[PDB]
Paper text:
Recent findings revealed that TNIP1 functions as a checkpoint mechanism that fine-tunes the rate of mitophagy by disrupting the recycling of the ULK complex during autophagosome formation. The phosphorylation of the TNIP1 FIR motif enhances its binding affinity for FIP200, enabling TNIP1 to compete with other autophagy receptors, such as CCPG1 or Optineurin. Here, we determined several crystal structures of the FIP200 claw domain in complex with phosphorylated TNIP1 FIR peptides and elucidated the specific recognition of different phosphorylated TNIP1 by FIP200 claw domain. Each FIP200 claw domain within the dimer features a five-stranded antiparallel β-sheet and a short α-helix.
For the FIP200–TNIP1_pS123 complex, in an asymmetric unit, four FIP200 claw molecules assembled into two dimers, with each molecule binding to one TNIP1_pS123 peptide. The homodimerization of the FIP200 claw dimer primarily relies on the interaction between the N-terminal loop of one FIP200 claw domain and the corresponding loop of the other claw monomer. A portion of the TNIP1_pS123 peptide was observed, forming a short β-strand packing with β4 of the claw domain. Further structural analysis of the FIP200–TNIP1_pS123 complex revealed extensive polar interactions (charge–charge interactions and hydrogen bonding) and hydrophobic interactions. The FIP200 claw domain utilized its positively charged residues, R1573 and K1569 in the loop connecting β4 and β5, to specifically recognize the negatively charged N-terminal of TNIP1_pS123 peptide. Specifically, the ε-NH3+ group of K1569 side chain established specific charge–charge interactions to the phosphate group of TNIP1 pS123. R1573 formed specific charge–charge and hydrogen bonding interactions with the side chain of TNIP1 E104. Additionally, the side chains of F125 and V128, located within the conserved LC3 interaction region motif of TNIP1_pS123 peptide, inserted into two hydrophobic pockets of FIP200 claw domain. Moreover, the ε-NH3+ group of K1568 side chain formed a hydrogen bond with the carbonyl group of TNIP1 S122 main chain. As anticipated, the ITC results demonstrated that point mutations in crucial interface residues, including K1569A, R1573E, Y1564A, F1574A, and F1582A of FIP200, significantly abolished the specific interaction between the FIP200 claw domain and TNIP1_pS123 peptide.
Residue numbers in the entry:
A (entry chain B): 103 to 109
B (entry chain A): 1494 to 1542, 1551 to 1594
The structure:
């Protein structure tokens, strides 16, 4: 996703 | 049997509300951390992208960070938050 990434 | 209000783990019963600030379902919590309901969970809870709150059971959580200022959660660029998958307590949808 371009909105968020897994930390 | 009782509603979790922080330190969410899988198996927890949680209260989920349609948040006005974010226009999104979030878990009710006393924690300073944001817990969003994962979009894939909406049909399991009989919600739609408009019920005001529902009880759910935590199946999964994922810690995330916003990479765009304009995102589905309406959080600022760089905000961290959990995304929580949930199901109904006792109905198979
Ligand atoms: Mg989502």
């Amino acid at each position: 996703s371009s909105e968020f990434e897994v930390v | 049997e009782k509603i979790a209000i922080r330190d969410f783990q899988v198996g927890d019963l949680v209260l989920i509300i349609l948040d006005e600030r974010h226009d999104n379902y979030v878990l009710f919590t006393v924690s300073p951390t944001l817990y969003f309901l994962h979009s894939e969970s909406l049909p399991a809870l009989d919600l739609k992208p408009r019920r005001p709150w529902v009880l759910g059971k935590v199946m999964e959580k994922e810690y995330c960070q916003a990479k765009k200022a304009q995102n589905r959660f309406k959080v600022p660029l760089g905000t961290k938050f959990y995304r929580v998958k949930a199901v109904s307590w006792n109905k198979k949808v």
